[PDB]
Design a protein around this nucleic acid. Structure first.
Ligand SMILES: [Mg+2]
Ligand SMILES: [Zn+2]
Ligand SMILES: [Zn+2]
Ligand SMILES: [Zn+2]
Ligand SMILES: [Zn+2]
Ligand SMILES: [Zn+2]
Ligand SMILES: [Zn+2]
Ligand SMILES: [Zn+2]
Ligand SMILES: [Zn+2]
Ligand SMILES: [Zn+2]
Ligand SMILES: [Zn+2]
Length: 277
DNA sequence: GTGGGCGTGGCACAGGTAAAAAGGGC
DNA sequence: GCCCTTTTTACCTGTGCCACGCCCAC
């Protein structure tokens, strides 16, 4: 047939596009209790909620979000039309937002520069400079009630609550497991299909996501940051050194309940215990 | 032949800044 | 609508758990 609206990937068959559109369904757990439309975050659902309010608003037809001013909606719609109406009058490069062009202008001469007093950061307006300057005074206005940790925004504070709640709203339809982030469900669903889009130029191995590719590459790079102060051996990961440190005291903290043998790391004990079972 | 030390794979994850995107006085 | 302000999401990379393949001691 053709492609998808959300992702846009071509499809040989219609049944392939439909079995693919169903993957978006798991990524959007915030469903409107009045019309069913679903969204990846409560913030975005709240944008959609305005269509059910008697107050005027301006809905985008293509994804059901609405705004309190027509100018907001029209600017927003450029995400769908792909228009880049703000052109650098000097080098010609085109951007979707005036805010993007403003930042880009610092790369050319004569821009208005908002330089940090205390480091080499520079910004295009005072509000951005001001927000950055909080990182020098240490002010983090949004504080977590459970642990006290401070955050730059209520969004970041919201996101961090996952450590206390364990909530996993993003559900896999094939196996049922839940995830804290839609991006991890996406990665998980790539693992189901063997869809490994990130490839290592040196050996060719493919991975489902950037972080697994990145750590893998350290084997080729020799990048072993954790060094043992006692014997000088280096490792890729903090927890190998941690286990190595143990190797020095000879502490085998894992013992088999059935036969009494002891092990240095839990995955040797765990492997050992399937000999019984 | 077997089992376990060893390094690294697979996985679900946090929290930082960069970037995108919504908000608003007039 | 301009001109920013303010909020929300993307991108990045280190993390610890157990699993897996390799290999040598036994
Ligand atoms: Mg400076
Ligand atoms: Zn799609
Ligand atoms: Zn609705
Ligand atoms: Zn839209
Ligand atoms: Zn330019
Ligand atoms: Zn600074
Ligand atoms: Zn907390
Ligand atoms: Zn699954
Ligand atoms: Zn490689
Ligand atoms: Zn050592
Ligand atoms: Zn045992």
């Amino acid at each position: 047939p053709h492609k998808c609206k959300e992702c846009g990937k071509a499809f040989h068959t219609p049944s392939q596009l439909s079995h693919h559109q169903k993957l978006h369904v798991g990524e959007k757990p915030y469903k409107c209790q009045e019309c069913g439309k679903a969204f990846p975050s409560n913030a975005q659902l709240s944008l959609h909620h305005r269509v059910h309010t008697d107050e005027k608003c301006f809905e985008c037809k293509e994804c059901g979000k609405a705004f309190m001013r027509p100018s907001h909606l029209l600017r927003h719609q450029r995400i769908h039309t792909g228009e880049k109406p703000h052109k650098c009058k000097e080098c010609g490069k085109a951007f979707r937002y005036d805010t993007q062009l403003s930042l880009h202008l610092l790369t050319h001469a004569g821009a208005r520069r908002f330089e940090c007093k205390d480091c080499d950061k520079v910004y295009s307006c005072a509000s951005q400079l001001a927000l950055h300057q909080m990182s020098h005074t240490g002010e983090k206005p949004h504080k977590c009630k459970e642990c006290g940790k401070g955050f730059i925004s209520d969004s970041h504070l919201l996101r961090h609550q996952s450590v206390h709640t364990g909530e996993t709203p993003y559900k896999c339809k094939e196996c049922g497991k839940g995830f804290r982030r839609g991006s991890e469900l996406a990665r998980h669903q790539r693992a189901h299909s063997g869809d490994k889009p990130y490839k290592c130029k040196e050996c060719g191995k493919s991975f489902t996501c950037t972080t697994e590719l990145f750590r893998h590459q350290k084997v080729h790079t020799g990048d072993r940051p954790h060094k043992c102060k006692e014997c000088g051996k280096a490792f890729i990961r903090r927890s190998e050194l941690t286990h190595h440190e143990r190797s020095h005291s000879g502490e085998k903290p894992y013992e088999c309940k059935e036969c009494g043998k002891t092990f240095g790391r839990g995955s040797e004990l765990s492997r050992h215990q399937k000999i019984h079972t």
